[PDB]
């Protein structure tokens, strides 16, 4: 003749166990309980004059010492209830005496700060009306460690020189999967960027500890951002580990130099929304074509191409700029009616103008003209930075000889 004893292990947040004083607990798996038969010491104490309660409290303290447990099992999910473990136990002994059992929480997950007290059960267990129960339900209560809300970092890789229009910019969102992640009901990472950044959808990789995360999320992408929705149950595998989301965005040709181009990362849980900003920039340089004798004389129709230190030529593609070796594919910049022209959408560096076509009445000089792109070489908060003078030498004493 047996009793079934079911333990429903509960976990409460730090400082929130009911003794410490709604819907703020969860079942906890992987808690090992041992059961000890304490029938003998129970009846000894009773014969010695101790009350039932007195003996039970003593047994709770000393009953496991020098006694091998008669059963051992772990809590697990049973019928969609987490933290369950059940034991089938004899009601009576050889002498026909109602038995007594001690339940000890032997080992428990890292999240537990304080284990449940030992439970001593003296059979028969009765309802308030004195009817013996065959199925007995206990609710041992664990206290959880204090844990922070998960952090967020948005990071742009190698961003100190800015970026060329067209360049594939590498980003990372980093967070820490908390130890108490099973306590959460929602975990979402998202990126949203200015319209001057276009997301490369196939670039999105989720890694934990350097290994790719295969499943456990949904992904939704737009032109300028995305959303990762994570299964809470599947995050448990990554508890206490760093998760890194890698992706790329292309900087578009609409990207103005010396403007903050913004993105915003977001971590959304049921508890809080955390937001992190990052920014990238591109660079430019303004020029004015002038006469070598009178700088107030500005010259239209001067035509230039742009070279880098390797001698490669700036080419314009559909989606940005590229450094290539064919001079025929070089983008052509032409001085306008006020002699003005600019180069926009370059990362910091040393570049050169090469004149390919001179204004009417001026000498062609093909000598490379050095210029520097750096923060604020184009503008400062909307205000344009003064143009570099490019001097042209007039055809010398023209109209004197045929
Ligand atoms: Na937490
Ligand atoms: Na990347
Ligand atoms: Na997309
Ligand atoms: Na400028």
198 CA from centroid of ligand 3 (Å): 8
Contact 88, 44 (CB under 8 A): no
33 CA from centroid of ligand 4 (Å): 74
Instruction: Give the residue numbers spanning the domain of 162.
Output: 153-280
Which of 223, 248, 280 is at the close of a domain? 280
Cα angle 345-346-348, degrees, rounded to a multiple of 5: 140
Answer whether residue 352 is part of any domain. yes
Cα angle 101-127-76, degrees, rounded to a multiple of 5: 55
Structure-solving method: X-ray
285 CA from centroid of ligand 4 (Å): 6
Tokens for 248, please give them.
Answer: 């790329």
Contact 263, 249 (CB under 8 A): yes
229 CA from centroid of ligand 3 (Å): 16
117 CA from centroid of ligand 4 (Å): 74
387 CA from centroid of ligand 4 (Å): 6
- Taking alpha carbons only, the member of 3, 99, 116, 108 closest to residue 60 is 116
Answer whether residue 354 is part of any domain. yes
Same domain, 267 and 368: no
Q: Using CA atoms, how far apart are residues 292 and 272, in angstroms rounded to an integer?
A: 64
Ligand number nearest to the C-alpha of 256: 4
Contact 321, 345 (CB under 8 A): yes
Tokens for 80, please give them.
Answer: 């969609």
As a whole number of Å, the end-to-end CA separation of the chain is 129
184 CA from centroid of ligand 1 (Å): 8
Specify the number of domains making up the chain.
Answer: 3
Same domain, 217 and 314: no
Contact 392, 359 (CB under 8 A): yes
Distance of CA 306 to the CA centre of its chain: 40
DSSP state of 98: B
245 Cβ contact partners less than 8 Å away, ≥ 6 residues apart? 172, 173, 174, 189, 204, 205, 206, 207, 228
Give the largest CA-CA distance in the chain.
138
Question: What beta strand segments (E) does 259-336 contain?
Answer: 261-269, 273-280, 283-291, 303-308, 313-316, 321-324, 333-334
Contact 209, 177 (CB under 8 A): no
Contact 391, 367 (CB under 8 A): no
Q: Using CA atoms, how far apart are residues 177 and 236, in angstroms rounded to an integer?
A: 8
381 CA from centroid of ligand 1 (Å): 41
147 CA from centroid of ligand 1 (Å): 5
Q: Using CA atoms, how far apart are residues 160 and 280, in angstroms rounded to an integer?
A: 9
Same domain, 102 and 185: no
Tokens for 310, please give them.
Answer: 């390797």
Contact 61, 116 (CB under 8 A): no
205 CA from centroid of ligand 2 (Å): 8
Phi, psi of 316 (to 5 degrees): -100, 125
- Taking alpha carbons only, the member of 106, 84, 104, 105 closest to residue 29 is 84
Ligand number nearest to the C-alpha of 288: 4
224 CA from centroid of ligand 3 (Å): 7
Question: Which residues keep their CB under 5 angstroms from ion ligand 2?
Answer: 170, 246, 248
Other residues' Cβ atoms within 10 Å of the Cβ of residue 233 = 11
- The CATH code of the domain that includes 17 is 2.60.40.10
Ligand number nearest to the C-alpha of 111: 1
Same domain, 34 and 56: yes
Q: Using CA atoms, how far apart are residues 347 and 324, in angstroms rounded to an integer?
A: 16
Same domain, 13 and 135: yes
The enclosing H or E element of 39 equals helix 39-47
- The CATH code of the domain that includes 213 is 2.60.40.740
173 CA from centroid of ligand 2 (Å): 11
**Percentage helix, strand, coil, to 5, in the chain?**
10, 50, 45
The enclosing H or E element of 15 equals none
Place of tokens 């473990």: 85
The region, left, alpha or beta by phi > 0 then psi within -120 to 50, assigned to residue 327 is alpha
Contact 372, 399 (CB under 8 A): no
Cα angle 268-273-278, degrees, rounded to a multiple of 5: 90
Q: Using CA atoms, how far apart are residues 356 and 306, in angstroms rounded to an integer?
A: 10
205 CA from centroid of ligand 1 (Å): 24
Contact 288, 333 (CB under 8 A): no
Ligand number nearest to the C-alpha of 171: 2
Same domain, 176 and 260: yes
Ligand number nearest to the C-alpha of 378: 4
Other residues' Cβ atoms within 10 Å of the Cβ of residue 306 = 22
143 CA from centroid of ligand 4 (Å): 63
Answer whether residue 399 is part of any domain. no
384 CA from centroid of ligand 4 (Å): 4
Question: What beta strand segments (E) does 66-156 contain?
Answer: 71-74, 76-78, 81-90, 100-107, 112-114, 119-122, 135-138, 141-144, 153-156
Same domain, 228 and 162: yes
Tokens for 324, please give them.
Answer: 């290539």
Contact 323, 310 (CB under 8 A): yes
Question: What beta strand segments (E) does 135-186 contain?
Answer: 135-138, 141-144, 153-156, 168-176
Cis peptide, bond prior to residue 308, ω within 30 of zero: no
Tokens for 260, please give them.
Answer: 């903050």
328 CA from centroid of ligand 4 (Å): 27
Per-residue exposure over 132-160, b if at least 16 CB sit within 10 Å of its own CB, e if not: eeeebebebbbbbeeeeebebebebeebe
Tokens for 51, please give them.
Answer: 């009350």
Tokens for 314, please give them.
Answer: 């700036």
Same domain, 318 and 221: no
């Amino acid at each position: 003749a047996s009793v079934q004893v079911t333990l429903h292990k509960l976990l409460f947040p730090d400082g929130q166990l009911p003794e410490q004083q709604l819907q703020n607990y969860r079942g906890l798996n992987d808690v090992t309980y041992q059961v000890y038969d304490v029938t003998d010491p129970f009846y000894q104490l009773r014969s010695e004059g101790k009350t039932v309660q007195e003996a039970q409290r003593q047994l709770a303290e000393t009953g496991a010492m020098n006694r091998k447990p008669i059963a051992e099992d772990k809590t697990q999910t049973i019928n969609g209830e987490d933290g369950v473990v059940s034991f089938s136990l004899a009601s009576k002994d050889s002498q026909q005496r109602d038995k007594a059992y001690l339940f000890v929480e032997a080992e428990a997950p890292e999240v537990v700060k304080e284990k449940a007290s030992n439970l001593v059960m003296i059979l028969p267990v009765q309802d308030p009306q004195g009817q013996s129960l065959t199925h007995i339900h206990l609710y041992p209560k664990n206290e959880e460690n204090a844990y922070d809300l998960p952090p967020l970092e948005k990071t742009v890789l190698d961003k100190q020189q800015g970026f060329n229009q067209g360049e594939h910019i590498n980003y990372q969102l980093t967070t820490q999967i908390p130890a108490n992640i099973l306590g959460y009901q929602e975990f979402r990472l998202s990126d949203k960027a200015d319209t001057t950044l276009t997301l490369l959808p196939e670039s999105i990789e989720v890694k934990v500890a350097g290994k790719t995360v295969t499943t456990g999320y949904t992904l939704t992408t737009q032109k300028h951002g995305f959303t990762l929705d994570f299964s809470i149950k599947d995050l448990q595998n990554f508890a206490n580990q760093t998760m890194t989301v890698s992706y790329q965005m292309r900087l578009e040709k609409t990207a103005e130099p010396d403007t903050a181009i913004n993105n915003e990362g977001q971590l959304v849980t049921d508890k809080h929304t955390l937001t992190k900003r990052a920014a990238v920039r591109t660079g430019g340089k303004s020029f004015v074509k002038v006469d070598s004798e009178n700088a107030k004389i500005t010259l239209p129709e001067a035509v230039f191409i742009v070279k880098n230190q390797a001698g490669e030529y700036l080419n314009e593609t559909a989606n940005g700029y590229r450094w290539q070796k064919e001079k025929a594919l070089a983008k052509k910049i032409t001085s306008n009616q006020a002699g003005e022209f600019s180069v926009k959408g370059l990362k910091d560096g040393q570049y050169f103008l090469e004149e390919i076509s001179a204004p009417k009445g001026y000498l062609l000089n093909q000598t490379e003209i050095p210029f520097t792109v750096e923060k604020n070489s184009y503008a400062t908060n909307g205000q344009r930075t003064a143009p570099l003078h490019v001097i042209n030498k007039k055809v010398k004493e023209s109209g004197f000889l045929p």
